Ligand binder design. Structure first.
Ligand SMILES: OC[C@H]1O[C@H](O[C@H]2[C@H](O)[C@@H](O)[C@@H](O)O[C@@H]2CO)[C@H](O)[C@@H](O)[C@@H]1O
Length: 371
């Protein structure tokens, strides 16, 4: 079970859990309350499993898209931020964590993928996906590749799929229509086909994952990668001179990354919702709390806390992140998002490996999602 008198927090392994732990230390120093920050694997799947039985951490961190499903299952406590505290955050961020209008989590920061390039290898990154193959050819001769990014999580390929028309759920009458899905439409198939062609042509490898792509970029083997702000810290420690910019266009349209808002929810079965609410509202969501997390791993292109965001939008990488966010779309938080990601994950992995054709893979995904 979840014992009272302390705080357990789950946050994904790619975020600043050491910096969050630092906010935890300051919390314990002030209240005597113990804070344990953990980053277990398959976090987004682990939480509804362990919390379905009544255990798990007291606070759960993840992008806002997974929260509607948690809420749907009664896994989250409606949060109780008073108007004063709500005033401290941008309205569209609270909106991201509204499930049927009610606040079900605290928003922390806005995330969007950008094109990250090695300035020594490519001082002038490509403006289009279509020029990437020629680029790879030229770089291959010197033992480098043009681009490597995680092909095992659809989040990373989605910008390309959405670029010429692909979409998850259509928004209509102030609501997402769970039967109007755009995963198998002409634009989605065109984007995924381009990706498969990159692989067929040996410009990318279907097996590439988050670790393989990060190591290749950080060791200077590949000129470009696609990743979010959280990844900048590790690049900073490498010897790579890099830039962060607008994603390549596809068929003349902007890549459209799905925008996520890192959010913190409170376990419905928690014996200490009070200590949770104070930790999040009075420690984490302060200029000092965010600085401590941000200092370990960048929080995103913008933060939900107005006082801190003013400072943040001070540089080119942040600018690039928000420019890509503006061309993308905020993710829905509906309960069907889990199904959408599962089906699209399988489709991209199957098309990339040749297990299914793009048309088979996406048709199947569309059916799985809507049946
Ligand atoms: O790949 C599907 C996956 O995409 C998103 O997860 C992102 C997350 O938002 C980022 O903060 C970062 O950690 O990378 C993840 C992808 O590996 C959705 O938030 C998630 O629900 C979905 O399963």
């Amino acid at each position: 079970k979840i014992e009272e008198g302390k705080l357990v927090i789950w946050i994904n392994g790619d975020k600043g859990y050491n910096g969050l732990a630092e906010v935890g230390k300051k919390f314990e120093k002030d209240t005597g309350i113990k804070v344990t920050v953990e980053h277990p694997d398959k976090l987004e799947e682990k939480f509804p499993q362990v919390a379905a039985t009544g255990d798990g951490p007291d606070i759960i961190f993840w992008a806002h898209d997974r929260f509607g499903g948690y809420a749907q299952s009664g896994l989250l406590a409606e949060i109780t931020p008073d108007k004063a505290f709500q005033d401290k955050l941008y309205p569209f961020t609270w909106d991201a964590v509204r499930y049927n209008g009610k606040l079900i989590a605290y928003p922390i920061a806005v995330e969007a993928l950008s094109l990250i390039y090695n300035k020594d290898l490519l001082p002038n990154p490509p403006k289009t996906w279509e020029e990437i193959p020629a680029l790879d050819k030229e770089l291959k001769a010197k033992g480098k590749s043009a681009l490597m990014f995680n092909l095992q999580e659809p989040y990373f390929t989605w910008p390309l799929i959405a670029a010429d028309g692909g979409y998850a759920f259509k928004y209509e009458n102030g609501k997402y229509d769970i039967k109007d899905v755009g995963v198998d439409n002409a634009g989605a198939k065109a984007g995924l086909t381009f990706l498969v062609d990159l692989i067929k042509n040996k410009h990318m490898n279907a097996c590439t994952d988050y670790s393989i792509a990060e190591a290749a970029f950080n060791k200077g083997e590949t000129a470009m990668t696609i990743n979010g702000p959280w990844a900048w810290s590790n690049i900073d420690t490498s010897k790579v001179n890099y830039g962060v910019t607008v994603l390549p266009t596809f068929k003349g349209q902007p890549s459209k990354p799905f925008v996520g808002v890192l959010s913190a929810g409170i376990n419905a079965a928690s014996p200490n919702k009070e200590l949770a609410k104070e930790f999040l509202e009075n420690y984490l969501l302060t200029d000092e709390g965010l600085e401590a997390v941000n200092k370990d791993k960048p929080l995103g292109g913008s933060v939900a806390l107005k006082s801190y965001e003013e400072e943040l939008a001070k540089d080119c990488r942040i600018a690039a992140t928000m420019e890509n966010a503006q061309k993308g779309e905020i993710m829905p938080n509906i309960p069907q998002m889990s199904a959408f990601w599962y089906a699209v994950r399988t489709a991209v992995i199957n098309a990339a490996s040749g297990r299914q054709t793009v048309d088979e893979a996406l048709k199947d995904a569309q059916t799985r999602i809507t049946k």
